[PDB]
């Protein structure tokens, strides 16, 4: 869950259709993430937990590390 849900959301903001089309190993700026598009992840991520999360982790996978880590 902490992985495929990122594959199914980072595209919802990026606009890619296939969930697997996310090169989840490449930098966010290299994937093409804007200010609004970066923070749209943070504002839809806690939609169903708790600022600069996605500049702290410039990689979809390396941000997805932060799900089950501390529970």
């Amino acid at each position: 869950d902490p992985v495929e849900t990122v594959r199914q959301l980072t595209a919802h903001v990026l606009g890619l259709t296939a969930a697997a089309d996310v090169e989840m190993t490449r930098s966010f700026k290299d994937l093409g993430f804007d200010s609004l598009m970066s923070v749209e992840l943070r504002d839809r991520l806690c939609a169903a937990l708790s600022t600069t999360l996605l500049y702290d982790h410039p990689s979809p996978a390396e941000t997805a590390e932060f799900v089950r880590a501390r529970l």
Binding site: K29, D34, S35, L36
Partner: protein, 820 residues
């Protein structure tokens, strides 16, 4: 300085709540905010800095049909208005820039009118909606051959434009340049797009460098600056409003986000431009910020400035932003900032940057060494200012500017009589205003003469000080060949030429030469100062023909000399009786000596005749009086044919009475029956005087009062002509007809009274020149000038050390033009 410093010699603008530089200084110095809610007549984020209205435009001034104006971008219209205003403020006459290398550089990045047009087609839409024409149109109306272009770098456009103008001047591609920009927020779709970008302040204010900074508020307007090289400007003697020492443009390059500004690029830009100008951080007295009030942008700009101009400086660098007053004009942001700086340089004062109370915690004002101007303080040390403008694509631009190194006539013109009314009213209100009282009435008259185009509807007001001239303007607010008719006997009055002598030294000099020569001639052969007889109101000596002919000759010759110095050079001349003597002299036929001898001999030989002569003005055709007097040739005859139904009968005072009674007819106050058989006794004596004078070929076209037609030199230079002129009838009506025939369209009465002018009007533009004679002659030249004649008003102010001063611009006859 590295490169040629560029002089700013004039500017114009339209800004929210500021129709011009005056109003702009008013708004800025008062620390007033022009930001308001969206006016009802607009469409819809709900705040902005808006002009009063954008639909008005004088389409007739610029030769634009209402059809073309309606499909025309209001940005194109406004830039037209701003171009004319900027040139006039620079002091230049636009006619003179025709076919020159004038360059036009305009920054624009929004096409709201075109969007409106397309969301709802004729051949004008192509030109009216295309952006390139914002500059190109100007080049076509002024006739400029210099480069004409529109540049879009985003919000930084207008400033870049000035840069490009500067470089174009330094290379010689253009000799004068107009530089600036325009942005008009008339469409809700652009507002929605910039709003969806999130850059917009929800409170509708630009909290530049303030901790409240949450975005910018939109603004609209436009602005122009006239630019010359410092060399060329100083050489031409222009009003320098500032000097650009250096300018540069770069791009952010590898920013974090496409829209995130770069500190390093901004620092590189600052370093480059100030090294090129050779200005250290201490020499900078102020920096006009981009200052949009954005959470991201403000810290970056502040940090760049503190890195380049903060370190190596004792006192805090004052900074501010006009976006706090009128908002973010985007495409036209840059120019606005510049104009602000310019007004601070000329005024040598600072104005508050509004919306500031607490420093942004992201901005260490103390460490960075910068302070926000909050007080309308003065400016101490010359003064140097710097302007920044940054585009969302990263194209940044900075510019370094430095500060600069009896009876009066006022002339106004306009393209419409109602426009003339408004021009006069505007000039009057300005003359009363403080800004106009800082200029003297002499300088004002000079600048009106030299720095304004003379449109087809003109007028001239006279006064001794400011108040007289002002009230004159208030009252105002409520062709062909030139022909001169010289007045004859009966137009004389006591006090001739006394007051012409005291105002204008030219009349005094010519009148003294003629009066000295005439004093000599009449002192040898008296009928001893003609000056005294003419100037004395308590003197009827002028009604005797021994004085009236020399008096008229002196008055008219000095009057012609003064009209000629004012440029008014007649092409066809004519004269009633003694009037001819002046006309033939000023034609160059007779020298001053021979002319004075002729006229004094005529007057004296006519004065020694016995009484019993009389002349009566009669409302009768020449045919009628020919019927009435035939058979009485030895006793009475036609003195003059002044009109189709106006003739003067001259003869024995006995025979004159029954003519008057038959037609009863105004009795003329004359001493003798001129142009009648009673003039035979003095004919032959006169015939010897004329036989001893030198007659030359005239320099102008002469029309004879004896012949009634154009007289040739062989005829005009014979003794018989002048004796017949002294004997026979003055055919003045036929002379007016002949002058009209050769091509005269403008008739001038040289002399006192308005008699000959009434006669010329009867025969048919008729102006009676003269008759306080300072007033009475400034009136003559004003009526000439407004009739179409090119009067060299410049040469009038050669006596005073007048200088060029800024003046209010043309009052445009604005009407609405829009779509539906």
């Amino acid at each position: 300085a590295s490169d040629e410093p560029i002089a700013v010699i004039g500017l114009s603008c339209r800004l929210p709540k500021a129709s011009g530089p005056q109003e702009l200084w008013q708004l800025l110095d008062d620390g007033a905010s022009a930001v308001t809610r969206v006016p009802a007549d607009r469409e819809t984020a709900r705040w902005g800095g808006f002009l009063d209205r954008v639909d008005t435009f004088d389409a007739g001034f610029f030769g634009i049909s209402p059809r073309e104006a309606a499909a025309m971008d209001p940005q194109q219209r406004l830039v037209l208005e701003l171009s004319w205003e900027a040139l006039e403020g620079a002091g230049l006459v636009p006619a003179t820039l025709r076919d020159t290398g004038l360059g036009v550089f305009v920054g624009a990045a929004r096409d709201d009118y075109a969007t409106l047009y397309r969301r709802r087609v004729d051949h004008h839409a192509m030109t009216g909606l295309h952006r390139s024409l914002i500059a190109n149109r100007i080049s076509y109306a002024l006739g400029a051959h210099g480069p004409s272009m529109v540049v879009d770098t985003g919000c930084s456009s207008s400033l870049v434009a000035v840069h490009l103008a500067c470089e174009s001047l330094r290379r010689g591609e253009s000799d004068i340049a107009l530089a600036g920009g325009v942005n008009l927020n008339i469409a809700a779709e652009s507002a929605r797009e910039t709003a969806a970008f999130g850059g917009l302040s929800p409170d509708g204010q630009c909290f530049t460098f303030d901790a409240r900074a949450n975005g910018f508020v939109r603004g609209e307007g436009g602005g122009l600056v006239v630019l010359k090289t410092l060399r060329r400007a100083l050489a031409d003697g222009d009003l320098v409003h500032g000097v650009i020492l250096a300018s540069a443009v770069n791009n952010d390059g590898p920013s974090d986000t496409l829209t995130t500004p770069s500190r390093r690029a901004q620092e590189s830009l600052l370093t480059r431009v100030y090294r090129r100008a050779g200005v250290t951080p201490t020499e900078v007295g102020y920096v006009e910020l981009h200052g949009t009030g954005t959470k991201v942008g403000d810290p970056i700009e502040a940090a760049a400035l503190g890195a380049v101009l903060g370190t190596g400086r004792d006192t805090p660098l004052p900074v501010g932003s006009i976006k706090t007053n009128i908002g973010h004009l985007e495409g036209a942001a840059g120019i606005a900032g510049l104009i602000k700086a310019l007004l601070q340089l000329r005024r040598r004062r600072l104005v508050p940057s509004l919306n500031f109370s607490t420093p942004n915690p992201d901005i260490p004002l103390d460490a960075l060494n910068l302070r926000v101007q909050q007080e309308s303080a003065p400016w101490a040390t010359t003064l140097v200012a710097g302007v920044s403008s940054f585009g969302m694509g990263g194209t940044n631009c900075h510019v370094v500017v430095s500060a600069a190194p009896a009876l009066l006539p006022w002339v106004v013109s306009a393209r419409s009589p109602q426009a003339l009314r408004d021009q006069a009213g505007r000039l009057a209100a300005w003359a009363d205003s403080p800004a106009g009282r800082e200029a003297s009435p002499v300088d004002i008259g000079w600048s009106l003469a030299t720095s304004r185009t003379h449109f087809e509807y003109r007028a001239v007001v006279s006064g001794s000080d400011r108040d007289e001239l002002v009230a004159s303007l208030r009252a105002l607010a409520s062709g062909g060949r030139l022909g001169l008719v010289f007045s004859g006997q009966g137009s004389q009055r006591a006090g001739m030429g006394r007051e012409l002598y005291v105002a204008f030294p030219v009349f005094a000099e010519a009148f003294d030469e003629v009066c000295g020569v005439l004093d000599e001639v009449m002192g040898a052969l008296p009928p001893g100062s003609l000056r005294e007889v003419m100037f004395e109101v308590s003197s009827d000596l002028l009604d005797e023909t021994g004085f009236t002919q020399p008096a008229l000759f002196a008055f008219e010759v000095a009057l012609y000399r003064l009209l000629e110095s004012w440029g008014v050079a007649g092409e066809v001349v004519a004269g009633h009786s003694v009037g001819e003597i002046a006309a033939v002299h000023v034609a160059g036929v007779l020298s001053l000596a021979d002319a004075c001898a002729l006229v004094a001999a005529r007057g004296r030989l006519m004065q020694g005749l016995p009484s019993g002569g009389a002349m009566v003005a009669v409302e009768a055709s020449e045919e009628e009086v020919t019927a009435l007097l035939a058979g009485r040739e030895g006793e009475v005859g036609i003195g003059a044919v002044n009109g189709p139904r106006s003739v003067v009968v001259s003869g024995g005072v006995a025979v004159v009475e029954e003519v008057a009674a038959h037609f009863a007819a105004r009795r003329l106050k004359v001493s003798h029956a001129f142009h009648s058989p009673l003039m035979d006794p003095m004919l032959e004596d006169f015939g010897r005087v004329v036989a001893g004078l030198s007659f030359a070929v005239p320099e102008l076209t002469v029309v004879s009062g004896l012949t009634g037609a154009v007289v040739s030199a062989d005829e005009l230079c014979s003794v018989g002509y002048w004796v017949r002129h002294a004997r026979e009838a003055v055919r003045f009506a036929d002379a007016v007809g002949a002058m009209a025939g050769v091509g005269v369209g403008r008739f001038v009465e040289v002399g006192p009274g308005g008699v000959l002018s009434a006669l010329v009007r009867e025969c048919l533009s008729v102006v009676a020149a003269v008759r306080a004679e300072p007033v009475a002659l400034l009136s003559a030249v004003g009526e000439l000038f407004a009739d179409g004649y090119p009067v060299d008003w410049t040469a009038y102010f050669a006596g005073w050390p007048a200088a060029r001063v800024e003046l209010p611009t043309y009052a445009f006859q604005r009407s609405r033009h829009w779509l539906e």
